[PDB]
Design a protein around this motif. Structure first.
Motif, PDB file in Angstrom:
ATOM      1  N   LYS A 181       1.967   2.203  -3.449  1.00 15.90           N
ATOM      2  CA  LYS A 181       0.906   2.555  -4.426  1.00 15.90           C
ATOM      3  C   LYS A 181       1.101   4.021  -4.834  1.00 15.90           C
ATOM      4  O   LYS A 181       1.277   4.858  -3.929  1.00 15.90           O
ATOM      5  CB  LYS A 181      -0.478   2.280  -3.832  1.00 15.90           C
ATOM      6  N   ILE A 194     -14.316   8.196  -0.692  1.00 15.98           N
ATOM      7  CA  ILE A 194     -13.821   9.393   0.021  1.00 15.98           C
ATOM      8  C   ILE A 194     -13.187  10.282  -1.029  1.00 15.98           C
ATOM      9  O   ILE A 194     -12.061  10.071  -1.450  1.00 15.98           O
ATOM     10  CB  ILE A 194     -12.833   9.038   1.169  1.00 15.98           C
ATOM     11  N   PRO A 195     -13.928  11.318  -1.477  1.00 13.55           N
ATOM     12  CA  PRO A 195     -13.399  12.173  -2.533  1.00 13.55           C
ATOM     13  C   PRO A 195     -12.082  12.876  -2.189  1.00 13.55           C
ATOM     14  O   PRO A 195     -11.788  13.075  -0.986  1.00 13.55           O
ATOM     15  CB  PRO A 195     -14.490  13.239  -2.724  1.00 13.55           C
ATOM     16  N   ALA A 196     -11.368  13.353  -3.199  1.00 13.07           N
ATOM     17  CA  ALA A 196     -10.173  14.214  -3.069  1.00 13.07           C
ATOM     18  C   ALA A 196     -10.591  15.514  -2.389  1.00 13.07           C
ATOM     19  O   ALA A 196     -11.753  15.953  -2.535  1.00 13.07           O
ATOM     20  CB  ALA A 196      -9.535  14.468  -4.418  1.00 13.07           C
ATOM     21  N   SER A 197      -9.659  16.090  -1.628  1.00 15.91           N
ATOM     22  CA  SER A 197      -9.853  17.316  -0.811  1.00 15.91           C
ATOM     23  C   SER A 197      -8.973  18.442  -1.361  1.00 15.91           C
ATOM     24  O   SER A 197      -8.136  18.186  -2.246  1.00 15.91           O
ATOM     25  CB  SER A 197      -9.531  17.046   0.647  1.00 15.91           C
ATOM     26  N   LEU A 202       0.856  -1.204   0.000  1.00 15.53           N
ATOM     27  CA  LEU A 202       0.000   0.000   0.000  1.00 15.53           C
ATOM     28  C   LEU A 202       0.889   1.251   0.000  1.00 15.53           C
ATOM     29  O   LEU A 202       0.538   2.211  -0.736  1.00 15.53           O
ATOM     30  CB  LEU A 202      -0.965  -0.092   1.183  1.00 15.53           C
ATOM     31  N   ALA A 203       1.995   1.235   0.748  1.00 12.82           N
ATOM     32  CA  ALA A 203       2.940   2.372   0.880  1.00 12.82           C
ATOM     33  C   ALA A 203       3.562   2.711  -0.489  1.00 12.82           C
ATOM     34  O   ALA A 203       3.876   3.901  -0.711  1.00 12.82           O
ATOM     35  CB  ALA A 203       4.007   2.067   1.889  1.00 12.82           C
ATOM     36  N   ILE A 210      -5.019   5.507  -6.543  1.00 13.48           N
ATOM     37  CA  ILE A 210      -6.034   5.730  -5.479  1.00 13.48           C
ATOM     38  C   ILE A 210      -7.440   5.844  -6.087  1.00 13.48           C
ATOM     39  O   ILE A 210      -7.636   6.527  -7.090  1.00 13.48           O
ATOM     40  CB  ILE A 210      -5.705   6.971  -4.634  1.00 13.48           C
ATOM     41  N   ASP A 211      -8.423   5.222  -5.451  1.00 13.88           N
ATOM     42  CA  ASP A 211      -9.845   5.245  -5.845  1.00 13.88           C
ATOM     43  C   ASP A 211     -10.569   6.207  -4.912  1.00 13.88           C
ATOM     44  O   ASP A 211     -10.660   5.941  -3.703  1.00 13.88           O
ATOM     45  CB  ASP A 211     -10.372   3.831  -5.814  1.00 13.88           C
ATOM     46  N   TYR A 212     -11.033   7.351  -5.417  1.00 19.65           N
ATOM     47  CA  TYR A 212     -11.765   8.392  -4.667  1.00 19.65           C
ATOM     48  C   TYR A 212     -13.293   8.213  -4.646  1.00 19.65           C
ATOM     49  O   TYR A 212     -13.989   9.140  -4.223  1.00 19.65           O
ATOM     50  CB  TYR A 212     -11.447   9.740  -5.307  1.00 19.65           C
ATOM     51  N   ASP A 271      -0.239   7.726  -6.433  1.00 20.14           N
ATOM     52  CA  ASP A 271      -1.508   8.487  -6.302  1.00 20.14           C
ATOM     53  C   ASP A 271      -2.424   8.120  -7.484  1.00 20.14           C
ATOM     54  O   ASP A 271      -3.649   8.182  -7.323  1.00 20.14           O
ATOM     55  CB  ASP A 271      -1.300   9.993  -6.195  1.00 20.14           C
TER      56      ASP A 271
END
Lengths: 94, 44
Positions: free
Chosen positions: B15, B25-28, B12-13, B20-22, B17
């Motif tokens: 992986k 939890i959407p991107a901020s 996971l470390a 990543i599947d948003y 960006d």
């Protein structure tokens, strides 16, 4: 005092989709540097998002709720994924 | 940790960006994290 709850099926789906265990997502609250933002009141509880470092290895973002009971609090884990570049930047330098 | 659990966290470390599947939890943005609290739920 704090206790944790979640839906077991949501935990399994979260691991399938995002690669994060809810049992590891709980550990963000044990990171003294975890960073938390409140989103909304939802179904009688406050929804929050928290960033923290898990097992010294990876920064994760956890979507959860918080509820206050008599003598204890409950955090419900809802979703979790690896933090991205901006979120890691807020976790380290915010 | 077991060797297998540690291996999952190290994968996971690594992986990117891009991976990543948003969808849950959407991107901020930095602005959404202006009112955050550090250590909010820390219990010693």
């Amino acid at each position: 005092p704090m206790e944790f709850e979640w839906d077991a099926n949501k935990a399994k789906s979260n691991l399938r989709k995002h690669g994060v265990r809810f049992e590891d997502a709980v550990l963000v609250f044990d990171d003294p540097r975890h960073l938390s933002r409140q989103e909304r009141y939802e179904n009688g509880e406050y929804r929050w998002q928290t960033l923290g470092l898990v097992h010294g290895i990876v920064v994760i973002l956890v979507a959860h709720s918080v509820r206050f009971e008599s003598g204890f609090d409950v955090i419900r884990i809802i979703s979790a994924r690896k933090a991205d570049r901006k979120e890691r930047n807020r976790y380290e330098h915010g | 940790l077991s060797a297998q659990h540690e291996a999952e966290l190290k994968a996971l470390a690594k992986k990117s960006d891009d991976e990543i599947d948003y969808s849950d939890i959407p991107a901020s943005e930095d602005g959404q994290w202006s009112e955050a609290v550090r250590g909010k739920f820390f219990r010693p």
